[PDB]
Amino acid sequence: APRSYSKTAKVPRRPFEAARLDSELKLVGEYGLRNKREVWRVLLTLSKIRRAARQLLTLDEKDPKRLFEGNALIRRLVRVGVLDESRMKLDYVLALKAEDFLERRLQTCVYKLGLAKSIHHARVLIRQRHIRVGKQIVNVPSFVVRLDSQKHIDFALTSPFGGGRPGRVRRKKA
Amino acid sequence: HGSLARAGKVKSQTPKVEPQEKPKTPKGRAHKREIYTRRFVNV
Amino acid sequence: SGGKPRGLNAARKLRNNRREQRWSDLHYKKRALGTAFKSSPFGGSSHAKGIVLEKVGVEAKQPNSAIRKCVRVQLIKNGKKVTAFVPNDGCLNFVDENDEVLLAGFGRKGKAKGDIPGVRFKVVKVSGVGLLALWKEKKEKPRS
Amino acid sequence: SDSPVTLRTRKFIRNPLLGRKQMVVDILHPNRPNISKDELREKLATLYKATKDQVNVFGLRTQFGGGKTTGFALVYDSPEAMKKFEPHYRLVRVGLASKIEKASRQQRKQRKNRQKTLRGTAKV
RNA sequence: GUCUUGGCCAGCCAUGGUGACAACGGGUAACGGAGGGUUAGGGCUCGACCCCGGAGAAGGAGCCUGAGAAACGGCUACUACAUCCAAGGAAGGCAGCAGGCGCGCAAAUUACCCAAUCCCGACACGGGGAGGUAGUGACAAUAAAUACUGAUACAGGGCUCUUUUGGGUCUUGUAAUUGGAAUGAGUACAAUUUAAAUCCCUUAACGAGGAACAAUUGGAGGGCAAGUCUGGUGCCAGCAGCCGC
Ligand SMILES: [Mg+2]
Ligand SMILES: [Mg+2]
Ligand SMILES: [Mg+2]
Ligand SMILES: [Mg+2]
Ligand SMILES: [Mg+2]
Ligand SMILES: [Mg+2]
Ligand SMILES: [Mg+2]
Ligand SMILES: [Mg+2]
Ligand SMILES: [Mg+2]
Fold this sequence. Notes:
Chain B is mostly helical. Chain B has helices at 9-13, 29-40. Chain B contains 2 helices and no strands. The relative contact order of chain B is 0.09. By secondary structure, chain C is of the alpha+beta class. Helices cover 19% and strands 28% of the residues of chain C. Chain C contains 4 helices and 6 strands; from the N terminus they run H-H-H-E-E-E-E-E-E-H. Chain C is elongated and about 75 Å long. By secondary structure, chain D is α+β, with helices and mostly antiparallel strands. Chain D has 4 helices and 5 strands; from the N terminus they run E-E-H-E-E-E-H-H-H. The A-D interface holds A 129, 132, 136-137, 156-158 and D 30, 64-67. One magnesium ion (MG) is lined by residues 7-9 of chain C. The structure holds one RNA strand. Chain D: Residues 101-124 are annotated as: Disordered. Chain D: Belongs to the eukaryotic ribosomal protein eS24 family. Chain D: GO terms for molecular function: structural constituent of ribosome. Chain D: Keywords: Ribonucleoprotein, Ribosomal protein. Chain A: InterPro entries: Ribosomal_uS4 (IPR022801), Ribosomal_uS4_CS (IPR018079), Ribosomal_uS4_euk/arc (IPR005710), Ribosomal_uS4_N (IPR001912), S4_RNA-bd (IPR002942), S4_RNA-bd_sf (IPR036986).
């Protein structure tokens, strides 16, 4: 069977716009990202919700299609944490910005919760198996943490921090 | 007046200068860190 | 504007008129007639291989004074003879008589690009080795 | 390891059609790599008051980060039911049945094709 | 005649049937479609190819068995190609799976197994290059390493004062000045996976200080982000999608 697969980013329409290049570099440095692709990734996803939210606003308020689809969109937004309970219904979705979707990343939250003291150290720890969510170890910095899950981040029980067992370097100096 | 016998003229006449060895630049996430530092921080 | 028909039952005239007038479009006419399969030196392919027959020099068009280095290549697939430009400084030495080279398009859609008159193809690989690889210090020409 | 191995059972169902009990087993084994198929079997047997030959497990995939494995466990009512029902590949790996030794697939096919040129008792 | 209707065919009779609303003929580098790409709307283009229908098994024709075939891993004949030979004869159809030649710009192992999906048989039991597994594999797609950090010294932006004793220690950089912890790429007891193996996953004892475990591909006049640097050549060599050097 032909297995479905898709793309998570788009190359910008104009390759060498000075304003666009500078704005992207603001997000890369602030959040300690890797390249421009995962910046384009978040913008593509953010466009998807914004495109979907706008197309429903064109319908009728009483129209059942808008009611079901609109509430479905908000539930993911509220659950993820980019949106609050007081943001009804969809006019506040259009105010979402690329920055807002970026704090919900595990790289940012591990830093905003004081686990790491620099955003570059924060990403390194996650990818290096030193951060777990609940009972689950997560090593993907793009892991989007929900508000419910935001209260269950701590170091891994196998890591020298939290677990206590010395690592390879500390054992070597013995 | 050019000719087929002049091929590779300047290429053969250019002296060979070896590249100066330098400390390696960081790659990936780190490479973006100094670029962001030099552009919007060290101002 | 034009005096196009505006009846409700004039779809036949509108389609027929569009079909006639679409032939004047250069790009549709090229595709519809299938001229790439008929008259192009390639069989509509992106690349083609051939045997180098000789090395020729082409004088650059005004205002430009230089001898562009080229080779006469006879395509293997159909036997047609074309002239291929040899790019980069001193790459004509790598090409020799009776070599097997791969040619590609030279610019945009079979039109000669730059100050090289009448040359519409370029040499990509010689003896199975990339010309850039030979031109740099990356690969070695086959011993043969 | 010093820490105990915790046994769990979900999706338990009694299946007299094959004379067995089907369930999914969960293991909590922190600070140790994993548990072998063998030592897994006695623990199930001692939990269900059965024998080692009463119990068979299919496949243990350890969960990412360690400390947990999941798999499909099969325990039988009678040892005869296991022998009659459990597939031969499962029997050979657990050890109470002999492997059916045979030639290579291509050689058996080549062996068969030569037979087609022979007729009667001359084949054997 | 056919399973049956039918100019399907045989006899007799009549002169009709199609066409400018494109018949007939020709081309297709045309299998049809569900659909792929790209689009505000209207569209353009592709569709050999994981699914449904059709046709074919070197090119035509004919036929037996059989419910079902004009079957080709069935037969018969002709054409082309081709194998063995004692020269009298015999035997053939990879657009099935591997593999080879040729062709080309252009596309993988003469591997393992029916364990999984199903099919077939007298059939719980046997068979299945259907099919699955593994190997080659930068077609395309997802996630994501190549580094983290404390202090010291210096500089900048602040803060009370400008007696300019200014670092005094809020922050950010430079630290060519040092101390640290951590890990996977790799490797391997063991366990796990599997029909049996491999890999992932899990994990003992190993595995990092730049010389290492060292990221490349294009470009720096404009379109279009980036040099008023230095050396060489001197309308030569060469660059340049276009304007141009
Ligand atoms: Mg009308
Ligand atoms: Mg065709
Ligand atoms: Mg074809
Ligand atoms: Mg026949
Ligand atoms: Mg084949
Ligand atoms: Mg440059
Ligand atoms: Mg430019
Ligand atoms: Mg500009
Ligand atoms: Mg000009």
